[PDB]
Amino acid sequence: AAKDVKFGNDARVKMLRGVNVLADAVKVTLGPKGRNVVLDKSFGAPTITKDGVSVAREIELEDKFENMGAQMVKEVASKANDAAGDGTTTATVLAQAIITEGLKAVAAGMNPMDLKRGIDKAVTAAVEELKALSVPCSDSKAIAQVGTISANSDETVGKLIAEAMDKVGKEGVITVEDGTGLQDELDVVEGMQFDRGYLSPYFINKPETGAVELESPFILLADKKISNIREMLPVLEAVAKAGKPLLIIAEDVEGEALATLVVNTMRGIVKVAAVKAPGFGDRRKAMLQDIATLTGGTVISEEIGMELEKATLEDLGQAKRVVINKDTTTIIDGVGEEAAIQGRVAQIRQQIEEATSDYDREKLQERVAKLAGGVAVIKVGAATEVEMKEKKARVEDALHATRAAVEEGVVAGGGVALIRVASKLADLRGQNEDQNVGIKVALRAMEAPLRQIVLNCGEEPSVVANTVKGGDGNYGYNAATEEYGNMIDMGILDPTKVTRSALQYAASVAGLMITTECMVTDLP
Amino acid sequence: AAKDVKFGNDARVKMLRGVNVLADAVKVTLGPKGRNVVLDKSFGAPTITKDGVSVAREIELEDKFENMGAQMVKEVASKANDAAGDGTTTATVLAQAIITEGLKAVAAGMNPMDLKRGIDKAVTAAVEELKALSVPCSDSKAIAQVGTISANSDETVGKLIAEAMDKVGKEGVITVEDGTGLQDELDVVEGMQFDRGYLSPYFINKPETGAVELESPFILLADKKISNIREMLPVLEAVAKAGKPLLIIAEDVEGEALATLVVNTMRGIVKVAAVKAPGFGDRRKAMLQDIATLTGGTVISEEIGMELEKATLEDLGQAKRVVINKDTTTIIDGVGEEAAIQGRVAQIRQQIEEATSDYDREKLQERVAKLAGGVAVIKVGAATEVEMKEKKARVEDALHATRAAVEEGVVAGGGVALIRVASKLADLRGQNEDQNVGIKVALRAMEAPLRQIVLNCGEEPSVVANTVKGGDGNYGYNAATEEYGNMIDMGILDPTKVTRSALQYAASVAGLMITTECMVTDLP
Amino acid sequence: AAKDVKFGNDARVKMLRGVNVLADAVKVTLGPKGRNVVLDKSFGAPTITKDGVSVAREIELEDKFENMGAQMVKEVASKANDAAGDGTTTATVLAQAIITEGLKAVAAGMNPMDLKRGIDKAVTAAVEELKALSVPCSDSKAIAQVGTISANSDETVGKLIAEAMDKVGKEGVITVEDGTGLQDELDVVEGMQFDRGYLSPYFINKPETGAVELESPFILLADKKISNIREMLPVLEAVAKAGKPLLIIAEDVEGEALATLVVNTMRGIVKVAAVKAPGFGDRRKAMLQDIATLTGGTVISEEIGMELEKATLEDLGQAKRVVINKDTTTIIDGVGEEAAIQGRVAQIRQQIEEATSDYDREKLQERVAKLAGGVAVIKVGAATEVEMKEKKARVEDALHATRAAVEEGVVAGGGVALIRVASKLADLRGQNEDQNVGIKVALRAMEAPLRQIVLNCGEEPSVVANTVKGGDGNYGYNAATEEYGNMIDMGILDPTKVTRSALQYAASVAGLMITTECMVTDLP
Ligand SMILES: Nc1ncnc2c1ncn2[C@@H]1O[C@H](COP(=O)(O)OP(=O)(O)O)[C@@H](O)[C@H]1O
Ligand SMILES: Nc1ncnc2c1ncn2[C@@H]1O[C@H](COP(=O)(O)OP(=O)(O)O)[C@@H](O)[C@H]1O
Ligand SMILES: Nc1ncnc2c1ncn2[C@@H]1O[C@H](COP(=O)(O)OP(=O)(O)O)[C@@H](O)[C@H]1O
Ligand code: BEF
Ligand code: BEF
Ligand SMILES: [K+]
Ligand SMILES: [K+]
Ligand SMILES: [K+]
Ligand SMILES: [Mg+2]
Ligand SMILES: [Mg+2]
Ligand SMILES: [Mg+2]
């Protein structure tokens, strides 16, 4: 359709107005004393949230040029959420500061591309300084402190996440989902477990708990649809002679074979249970081979040149306990050599290194956890559903921040690390005067998060900013208790990855946004 | 539908208004100090661009006569993009200058057809002068300079493209795609490679890298669907006696034959890998014949009169190394006579000479690169997605400019070549006074790009243009560093093809736009 | 729906307003100094045309009585384009002049039917005078001059058309298509050629050019389906004994016969190529019989009572060379007696004389051209697409004018022939005074084209008209150089057919339009 075309300062003013609208909506939720935003939903009740990307993803304006400005600045928060899972409000605050100062410098007669180059140079130097300023985060106390800070100063969430990380291990998986009561609970599983249960209720040998218990059984791993029992007679006779229980993992067991097995169980001849293989497609084969490696067995498939009639005792894996119930199967203390397990997990790790999407990496890491580490689930408890959603979001944020701190270390929080970096970069110079102006723009915009944090508390940002800048090291301002001190001692920690990512994406979007001269959109 | 008819000066005023709207939208992005344009997208985020055709393709006007003018001038940029891939803003600037001066002459009582004829004569003479003025671009330093200038003065892109062109050769192919990191990378693959992987995971003999590696194999090229093992026993027996691996490139293999092959693999009988033939249809046959000529083998086809059971060791190709992964297959150092490869590439070159669509030519050039040269891929790295899109567009422009400069030579940049040509054409004359006026119109319009480049810098175009006109040779004006000097020494190079194409298309459209007397369009 | 009814002078002024609008849109493009008209297209870009019928076909008006007038006067241009292919602006100018003068006469109280009868009488006498005034046009110089004049004074177009007409001969056909370069080229084909290529790439015996070449082949013409080699075997063995190649033109060939033929090809047994028959249906039989009578063979069909298995060397045609490629087949120097060719072309001529649509006549003419003369194609080259379209239209107009001038002769151009005729018809009288008034109306309207040509030049039409009327013979006015002289020596020629058609159609529509008294249309 027809277009509307604007040039120069008019387009820049519309774009800045849209950016300011989105940023002012988002920045009320920053810090320990930030407040909540209510977001209307078409299908359901409103959501009360304190998360920056959640607020940013629903801001849209009726003016089309202002909406273009807002849509451009929204990508900073979206990309920060995708990268680190935290630090999105800080990214938006930095982007708005850079855009405002850059437009003010452009209107003074500077070349926008030289300003962009200066911003790029300052940001590269700042990221180098941040990496040199980081400190490792290894003890459980520091992980608890990071999880507490990220969950809006909540001691219990940090303590729970620290305990979960301690029990599960370095190669495990922790997940968050909705609970039932009013308290948080942590359920950890050791060993391997998949969401497939027994195929016949008569298999139950312990009616008290409604579960199948087997002691030191054999595991028959068959990559084949089992329908006729005639294929199953040799191994059945073998295990009957041996006298130990048998577990059959296959794609399915049909009516007559299942009937034969169940009839044989309750007569005291053989102790048999049968469950279906987990997953759909090639992943089924992968986890079948994982179980085979764990229990020291062999997968009986027709694509390798084996038939189940020829299966013998050494082809059956062995475990210590198998617990099957209506929904889950658990294999406990599988008998398998450590070398094979390490080789398999190494193969999965190098497979992880060559994965693109999040879904594949999550599945592969879950497989590594099943083979080697553990899997935990955190249940969030709240009285109402809105409180449940808000607490679940906070817990997920704390989980992400603790992970990032584990990979890349921690720096002093509260906006002090960026101030220290900007004070260190005071002698950085570029090629020409416009690049110097851009460097100064970036360095001055690095002080925005602390000023906004102090502003949300109702105090005077300039006095606090000058007092913090007058110090050195980890000297900072505690916004919760309104006192100065050492932020490392007070337990106010931020991951280096979150800070660095926020700075990088903010600069990347803002530098491009500064250079606009013309702006084209549809007519009202 | 009912129409609106407008005559003479009113029609010309509306047309010039539309042309001016589109040209002023496009011309803010010209030079080293041009800026960006934000284009609103219905599906997604806004697009920030500096490319002329991208801006031109979006402009539309609500008035209908003005929209006719804009739609008519848009074809200059479209044609320049399709022909050379670069120089669209310069073409638009030249078109607008010619249209403005020509309408000014027509309003003074000149015959538009004679003005058109004079403009065409001047443009023909100018193209001859430009061809007489160019210089070869053969060493890598000049290629780097051209790629740097065409990428908004980005040295790294120019050096990367120079290295890629050095490695991949004269007959190679270079493509640009999205990366994942923050740094650009170049990955060149030598030899022939196709994107078809192994047909069964059990074929892998190197689990550490997950690759199927074979040393000096036989290659069996079956242009048919392989159904039963029985058709293959003679070949397998011969290869097993021979004692070296065998690679089966066929249309596909089902469960039975593949099961037999895989069973034989790990038993130590014969080392065999199977992959699917690349392509779909006739191109599949062409690729199979290319592999046959490269490796020195024969394709087993029913339409030629041979069967798989009759195949011998003479119909099998040979190589030195074959590496297969989950997605790619690589044939390294095929053992074949160079004469056959030269004949095949000459035949494909002849096929190229009679190729119309660009897709077919691209596929044929990729096939020639596989046979004779290499394939290089440049992966662009950026922090966000808008930055990625801009960097990718600039890298593509630099690639096109370097190709054009290699094929046709380079002239002085900055709009200096056009000014030198116009100064050389100072005594050209036509048959009557209107033709002379048209010649002068074209000569005056040839100075527009330099004036616009100086205008975007905040300088005065008149003084700079006069000073440049006062010099001779490669003397010019550097807009980045704001000084005068030799354009060749300071590295501002422009392909002759881009300049010539821009001038030709601009004149071709502007001359016809000048001769309009009536306009017919729908009612509002 | 409800109707609106207007009576008398109101209806007549509405009609004249519509006529004036369309004619003023059209007449700006008349003469050597007429201009271009931009026509808006809903799907694509606007077209810049100088063709009168093209301008007329897109005129429609919001008012409904004015739209009736425009829709009525549009038929003159449509009919003139359909008949002669040229001279539509002149027809519209004549129609408007007649309508204006006739309405002026009617307003003075004269019977419209008598005016119509007088106009018809005058036009009949004028057409007789035009037929008597013509001179033959057979020289290549005169054909070049006609093509130059009709192509808007383009020497190259006239020269190219003259050369093409000389090469193809009297009975040949010439077509115009889009070229690829910037220069026009002429591509003439000698012999017979049809657009069917080889059925298998392995028939190629010259792979440097990728074409099949046979020297002194045998041509097997079979109007049947061939799938099994059993009915093909005896003639194949006979050809193998003969020792010379064979070309099979049939309906098509299935896999069995094609595989057999190709298998015998590269073994050196028989040099065989197979193609499909041209055409679909009865026309396919017609071209099969044409090839048979050209090469001196017999068509094998079931509907005549012959079988392929019974074929001998007598039923096989013979040629001197056959070249086949991906798309075209050419038979060079067929061995046939010219009496058969003459009889066949005579049969097709009598078929031509009894053809209603132009499409069947075009196919029959192409068949005669393939039998006797040649087929040429002119490729029009231009830089852009708008220039391409306008140049192609001009070339087609020049081709139409050249054919018409060959058919019926030439007269002096610039509107001088009509003036001479009108001067010769000064003594013509009717039955009553109103018929005499109608005759004078027609004679006055015959002077409109020269007046409009002079008006488009910026000169004063009345003085030029009187000076031309004062002369005699071919004395006229040259609007290109603004000079008087002999129109024949200056090279300004028009076909007699075009002038006669324009006059006839203009008078035919205008006479009816004069006699209106009431108009009935829908409500606005
Ligand atoms: N008690 C505190 N004193 C000072 N600063 C704090 C305190 N708690 C948190 N902060 C700072 O406030 C910021 C929290 O902002 P938040 O609302 O979580 O937005 P984001 O989505 O960017 O994390 C952190 O960067 C942290 O440095
Ligand atoms: N440093 C420089 N000094 C002077 N002129 C330059 C410099 N760099 C590029 N140019 C000129 O600017 C033009 C580049 O225009 P650009 O914005 O790339 O549009 P396009 O490539 O579409 O024509 C070229 O004609 C080139 O001669
Ligand atoms: N050099 C010339 N001097 C005078 N008359 C000319 C000249 N060239 C062409 N003409 C006249 O102009 C007319 C061409 O008008 P044109 O635009 O072709 O309209 P049409 O569609 O009726 O052919 C011809 O009738 C021809 O007699
Ligand atoms: F404006 Be061009 F695409 F460099
Ligand atoms: F306008 Be006509 F077709 F010469
Ligand atoms: K927040
Ligand atoms: K540009
Ligand atoms: K015309
Ligand atoms: Mg956080
Ligand atoms: Mg460019
Ligand atoms: Mg004409």
Residue numbers in the entry:
A (entry chain B), B (entry chain C), C (entry chain D): 2 to 525
Article, verbatim:
The bacterial chaperonin GroEL cooperates with its cofactor GroES in assisting the folding of roughly 10% of newly synthesized proteins, including proteins with α/β topology that fail to fold spontaneously. GroEL is a cylindrical complex of around 800 kDa containing two heptameric rings of 57 kDa subunits stacked back to back. The apical domains mediate substrate protein (SP) binding and the equatorial domains mediate ATP binding and hydrolysis.
Encapsulation occurred following the addition of GroES and ATP-BeFx. The remainder contained only a faint, smeared-out density, representing empty chambers and chambers with incompletely folded or misaligned MetK.
